[PDB]
């Protein structure tokens, strides 16, 4: 799987 940046915090 490719890993991406989170753009919306929980």
């Amino acid at each position, epitope marked *: 799987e490719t890993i991406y940046n*989170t753009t919306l915090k*929980y």
Partner: antibody, heavy 125, light 109 residues
């Protein structure tokens, strides 16, 4: 090959409800955030809602707020979209989709990578 | 919301040619811009993310550029499978996640 199979769509009356289901396989369901996106006939893609991998955080598009509820049953690898108080403008092809993984799991990626085939919803009297 | 507007609405090209599609945003999304490919009534396919990164399995003829509010998708050496609808999506300022109105690549004649 990720597989997302939708069902539960159909024809409904204004004010009534539907609950869409999206069966997932071909990936680790419990690790990915999931989305619902809709597309009205001849119109553009409109984001509907998102839910975290563990179903603990949710966000909705203003238009469906208080009416739609996104949820998931990880044991069953199923994502749902409860659609209450349906309106004519809710008519559209509804897609469920997964988003890519984040590196630190501090939030969503918003990277919608794999989509289902969609299920149609028609609201009319 | 961040409104995405694509141009042109329809591009008439034939195999082998180069497609240039633009996507503009009402306000900055940094480089968090995604490009999708879709055929009517079918599942969209991820092509490029973060404006210029090609997704797994996506061929080199697909490239992207731009940042903030002005982006460009380029498809060189067009092949039959490329004639479809293309949508841009932003994940830089959400919710809500937003998409462009799409650009259709039709067969020229």
């Amino acid at each position: 090959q990720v597989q997302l199979v939708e069902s539960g769509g159909g024809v409904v009356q204004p004010g009534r409800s539907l609950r869409l289901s999206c069966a997932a396989s071909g990936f680790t369901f419990s690790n990915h955030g999931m989305h619902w996106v809709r597309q009205a006939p001849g119109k553009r893609l409109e984001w509907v809602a998102v839910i975290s991998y563990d179903g603990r955080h949710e966000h909705y598009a203003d238009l469906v707020k208080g009416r739609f509820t996104i949820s998931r049953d990880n044991s069953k690898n199923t994502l749902y979209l409860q659609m209450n108080s349906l309106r004519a403008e809710d008519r559209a092809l509804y897609f469920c989709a997964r988003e890519g993984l984040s590196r630190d799991n501090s939030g969503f990626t918003g990277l919608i990578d794999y989509w289902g085939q969609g299920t149609m919803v028609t609201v009319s009297s | 919301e961040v409104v995405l507007t694509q141009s042109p609405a329809t591009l008439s090209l034939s195999p082998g040619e180069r497609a240039t599609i633009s996507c503009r945003a009402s306000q900055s999304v940094g480089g968090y811009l995604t490009w999708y490919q879709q055929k009517p009534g079918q599942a969209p396919r991820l092509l490029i993310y973060d404006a210029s990164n090609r997704a797994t399995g996506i061929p080199a003829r697909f490239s992207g550029s731009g940042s903030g509010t002005d982006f460009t998708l380029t498809i060189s050496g067009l092949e039959p499978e490329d004639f479809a609808i293309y949508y841009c999506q932003q994940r830089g300022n959400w919710p809500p996640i937003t998409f462009g109105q799409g650009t259709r690549l039709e067969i020229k004649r």
